[PDB]
Design a protein around this ligand. Structure first.
Ligand SMILES: NC(=O)c1ccc[n+]([C@@H]2O[C@H](COP(=O)([O-])OP(=O)(O)OC[C@H]3O[C@@H](n4cnc5c(N)ncnc54)[C@H](OP(=O)(O)O)[C@@H]3O)[C@@H](O)[C@H]2O)c1
Ligand SMILES: COc1ccccc1-c1ccc2c(N)nc(N)nc2c1
Length: 157
């Protein structure tokens, strides 16, 4: 299965200055739960943002840099290489990867951040005419998690 994994706000902002615009520990827990034991594919900027491969899953980085050879990371140089990756593969970002893959994936695990943030990078527009809501779950709010959010699983119709 090939899936998108993304958190975006009410206006589809995903990032600002190579970081996330929000602090939301529960979304990181969600990412951990979904992708542990599986594969993440990310663009080079997203990788450099996170700084190191995420533990307990396969980290694959897409880059044109033929000098990229980082410990604990697999490298690919073409979108086409993604389709040769075994198992459950999650497209992990960023904007460029999401733009290249939204028409290709089977489903999407979206955390809708129910706020309006300043962004410089966006998830591409999409319509519920194309996507079935397999599940929609409101995130619980507390002292550490203060922004309303909804976990959506969308499956291509
Ligand atoms: N909210 C979220 O769910 C989420 C998730 C991830 C990231 N983000 C945010 O997204 C932003 C980064 O997005 P971005 O679009 O600037 O960067 P990106 O997608 O992370 O990385 C772009 C880089 O990926 C490589 N790449 C992409 N397609 C390629 C292809 N077909 N062939 C070869 N290389 C390819 C290139 O690397 P080279 O230049 O090295 O060739 C390109 O410059 C940041 O703000 C980050 O915080 C948000
Ligand atoms: C730059 O992105 C991050 C920085 C620090 C911690 C976590 C993230 C990060 C990266 C990718 C993500 C992705 N594809 N989906 C969701 N729902 N959350 C993410 C969070």
């Amino acid at each position: 299965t090939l899936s998108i994994l993304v958190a975006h706000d009410l206006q589809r902002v995903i990032g600002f200055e190579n970081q996330l615009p929000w602090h939301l520990p529960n979304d990181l827990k969600h990412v951990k739960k979904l992708s542990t034991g599986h594969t993440l594919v990310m663009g080079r900027k997203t990788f450099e943002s996170i700084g190191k491969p995420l533990p307990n899953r396969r980290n694959v980085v897409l880059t044109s840099d033929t000098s990229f050879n980082v410990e604990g990371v697999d490298v690919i140089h073409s979108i086409e290489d993604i389709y040769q990756l075994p198992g459950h593969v999650f497209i992990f970002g960023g904007q460029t990867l999401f733009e290249e893959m939204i028409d290709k994936v089977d489903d999407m695990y979206i955390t809708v951040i129910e706020g309006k943030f300043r962004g410089d990078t966006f998830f591409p527009p999409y319509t519920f005419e194309d996507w079935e809501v397999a599940s929609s779950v409101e995130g619980k709010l507390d002292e550490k998690n203060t922004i309303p959010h909804t976990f959506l699983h969308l499956i291509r119709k």
